[PDB]
Design a protein around this ligand. Structure first.
Ligand SMILES: Nc1nc2c(ncn2[C@@H]2O[C@H](COP(=O)(O)OP(=O)(O)NP(=O)(O)O)[C@@H](O)[C@H]2O)c(=O)[nH]1
Ligand SMILES: Nc1nc2c(ncn2[C@@H]2O[C@H](COP(=O)(O)OP(=O)(O)NP(=O)(O)O)[C@@H](O)[C@H]2O)c(=O)[nH]1
Ligand SMILES: C=CC(=O)Nc1ccc(S(=O)(=O)N2CCC[C@H]2C(=O)Nc2cccc(OC)c2)cc1
Ligand SMILES: C=CC(=O)Nc1ccc(S(=O)(=O)N2CCC[C@H]2C(=O)Nc2cccc(OC)c2)cc1
Ligand SMILES: [Mg+2]
Ligand SMILES: [Mg+2]
Lengths: 209, 212
């Protein structure tokens, strides 16, 4: 078991990199958010796909905590399909280990998030079932009582082993008022649609300020 | 080395510390919340200094901090002035992070540097080794504070032990000057300078804050 020196140095590396990044943003605005979910659901894969278009299938469980950036451009996303001239958005995309060994390390990074990507594994029902607790965890620890969440039933490319019925998943999302997307980190289905939704939900919350 | 992962109990603690923090923060979403953070080697006096500060009390049993905690104290801060021009009393809600010191908690404690507008660095006067590591703490603070050239006050703690004092006074004033930081010699037991150092830190933060 016992946590090793080499793994802490990586985490100090991520931390050292975040601390550097914040010091510089000091684009148009920096929009931070955070992906979480049981481990082995594709947080890293999903984010990797989204940023780089690639996908490794070797499972490399996240060493506690990591983050990525995309310099995307956000546009209006207005009513009945409008689009006013949109902004530059530096993105920061936290990736949390879903394991026990880091439940208390990852939960400290919620404070830096402005939205959330809650992931489950369409091929693993317990991923789906534990989704309620994850949401509980987010109201309890995020920095607004009703934090913006987009849910993702990831691994949509593995139909011959999909045990979560879209009915049950849409029903869970409707019960909380959270957008649902079924996603694949293999081939990128809805990977863009889903995080951009969060971005809209997040950017629109700032124009309520 | 062989650093143990957090037991569930250990993680139980820290999760409710976090839960505590979340509420505090959300609640403040007639004041001015100010935070800072205690750090330095294990056993140098970190919690005790803070417990002396908030409750005017001291406990002899070493109760090593399980990763992270924080204490609060309401206070009134009045501006400094060029000819004793002390300004209006500001209510200042104070959150005081107490970080562990054992290395096995290093990356958990460093996470919280983004929440701390200043740092209270402790070594022990009865332990030169703790005093020697202080350079590496400042280097860890330059590296991971979310503002650069961050505000630090350095505390030589345990000053009420003079038969056990080993850190020469001059070596510390030296350091504190080379790095240009306030140095205080403190006692978490009798309370000598505890208040003065913490008041100094908030002052720095306060003046630093209104650079605008
Ligand atoms: N077919 C398919 N496999 C995927 C997809 N996303 C991840 N996987 C696979 O599922 C496993 C889990 O990947 P990973 O990104 O590490 O998941 P994670 O939830 O971030 N793990 P951790 O929480 O430990 O960081 C890997 O073997 C990966 O290749 C996806 O969209 N489709
Ligand atoms: N005589 C004396 N004892 C002190 C003083 N400050 C702390 N102590 C004692 O020395 C030990 C230091 O304990 P404590 O300050 O709680 O540890 P800490 O700095 O928070 N380290 P940790 O990272 O393990 O939580 C305890 O036994 C405490 O009671 C002081 O000024 N004088
Ligand atoms: C939970 C999600 C939700 O639904 N709402 C929600 C909850 C929390 C947060 S937030 O706490 O993370 N947050 C607000 C904006 C940025 C940051 C902040 O406050 N300050 C800051 C200031 C200066 C610099 C700096 O980086 C360099 C950062 C945002 C949205
Ligand atoms: C607070 C301590 C800390 O840990 N970090 C930290 C330190 C300083 C600042 S500072 O911007 O305010 N500042 C500008 C220069 C120094 C200092 C100042 O005002 N006067 C001064 C003090 C000593 C010698 C000296 O040379 C003539 C001048 C901000 C953060
Ligand atoms: Mg991962
Ligand atoms: Mg302590």
């Amino acid at each position: 078991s016992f946590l090793t020196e080499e793994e802490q140095e990586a985490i100090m590396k991520v931390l050292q990199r975040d601390a550097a990044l914040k010091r510089a943003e000091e684009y148009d605005y920096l929009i931070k958010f955070l992906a979480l979910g049981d481990s082995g659901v594709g947080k890293t894969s999903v984010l990797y796909q989204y940023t780089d278009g690639k996908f490794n299938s070797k499972f490399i469980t996240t060493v506690g905590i990591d983050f990525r950036e995309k310099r995307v451009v956000y546009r209006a996303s207005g009513p009945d399909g409008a689009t006013g001239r949109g902004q530059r958005i530096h993105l920061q995309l936290w990736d949390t280990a879903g394991l026990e060994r880091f439940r208390s390390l990852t939960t400290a990074f919620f404070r830096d998030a402005m939205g959330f990507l809650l992931l489950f594994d369409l091929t693993n029902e317990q991923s789906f079932l534990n989704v309620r607790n994850w949401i509980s965890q987010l109201q309890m620890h995020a920095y607004a009582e009703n934090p913006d969440i987009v849910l993702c039933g990831n691994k949509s490319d593995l139909e011959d082993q999909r045990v979560v019925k879209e009915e049950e998943a849409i029903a869970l999302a409707e019960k909380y008022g959270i957008p649902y997307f079924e996603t694949s980190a293999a081939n990128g289905t809805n990977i863009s649609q889903a995080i951009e939704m969060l971005l809209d939900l997040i950017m629109k919350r700032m124009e309520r300020s």
